[PDB]
Amino acid sequence: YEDGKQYTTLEKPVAGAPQVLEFFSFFCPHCYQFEEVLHISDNVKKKLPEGVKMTKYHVNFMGGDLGKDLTQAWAVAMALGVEDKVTVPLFEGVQKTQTIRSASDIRDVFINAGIKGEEYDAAWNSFVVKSLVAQQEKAAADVQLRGVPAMFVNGKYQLNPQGMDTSNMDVFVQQYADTVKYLSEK
C-alpha cells in the first residue's frame, strides 16, 4: 500500500463524513457492475467490523435531465428506507431494459416495488427530500467529485480501483475490500 497506488489521500479532508462513503449513478456502467455483478458494498461491509456506517449517494452529472430526477428518487429511497427494494429495478430499468425515460417511469419502479402512490408523491415533494438532495450534492462537492463509482474512507482517502487486478473478479473484490479495511484502520 502506497498513497497514489491503491488509494489517494484527499488534500482537504471532510469532517463529519461517514466511515464509508460511496457515490454512484444509475447511468454509470461500472456502477452497474459494482452493484449487480460484484456486490462491492456488500463484500466491503463483510470485511469491516459490524456497525460501521456505510453511506451511498447518487450523483447528478450523468444521464442529462434524468440524472437529477434519479438523485431525487434516491433521496426518496433513503427517506423511506426502501433502497434494497428499488436499487436493482432502477439499475435494470436504466441500463438493461432502458424502460426508464422520465420521472413517471422512475415512479413506476417504486409503485411496482410496493410503495404506495400517495407516499411516494408526498416524499418526492417533501422538504426532507429536498434537503437529502442538497446533502448528496454537497457531499460530492466536498470531495470535488469527477466520476463514479467512487468510495471514500473516513473522509480522508479515495479508493483507486484502476490499480487493481481485473483478470479475476474475486481477486478484484478481495483487493478492493482489503484496501477499504486497511484504510479504515489507518
- Residue 14's identity, in one-letter code, is V
Q: How far apart are CA 8 and CA 46, in angstroms?
A: 23
Bridge-based pairing of strands 7-9 and 20-24 is unpaired
Q: Is 138 in the site for ligand PKN (CB under 6 A)?
A: yes
Cis preceding linkage at 89, omega within 30: no
Q: Residue 151 CB: number of other CB atoms within 10 A? A: 26
Instruction: Supply the minimum distance, in Å, between the C-beta of residue 178 and ligand PKN.
Output: 15
User: Which H or E run contains 177?
Assistant: helix 169-184
Work out which of 17, 70, 123, 153 binds ligand PKN, going by CB under 6 A. Answer: 17
- Residue 42's identity, in one-letter code, is D
For ligand PKN, the binding residues in 78-137 under the rule CB under 6 A are none
Instruction: Supply the minimum distance, in Å, between the C-beta of residue 25 and ligand PKN.
Output: 9
Work out which of 4, 11, 16, 127 binds ligand PKN, going by CB under 6 A. Answer: 16
Q: Is 64 in the site for ligand PKN (CB under 6 A)?
A: yes
In the bound complex, which residue of the shown chain has the CB atom lying closest to ligand PKN?
A: 33
Q: Is 161 in the site for ligand PKN (CB under 6 A)?
A: no
Which burial class, exposed, middle or buried, applies to 45 when counting CB atoms under 10 A from its CB (0-12, 13-18, 19+)? middle
Residue 169 — left, alpha, or beta (φ > 0 → left; ψ -120 to 50 → alpha)? alpha
Q: Is 13 in the site for ligand PKN (CB under 6 A)?
A: no
Work out which of 53, 169, 185, 186 binds ligand PKN, going by CB under 6 A. Answer: 169
Q: Is 52 in the site for ligand PKN (CB under 6 A)?
A: no
The dihedral through the CA atoms of 153, 16, 150, 144 has a sign that is negative
In terms of CB distance, is 19 or 115 closer to ligand PKN? 19
Work out which of 139, 153, 177, 180 binds ligand PKN, going by CB under 6 A. Answer: 139
Residues that bind ligand PKN (CB under 6 A): 14, 16-18, 21, 33, 37-38, 55, 60-64, 67-68, 138-139, 142, 166, 169, 172
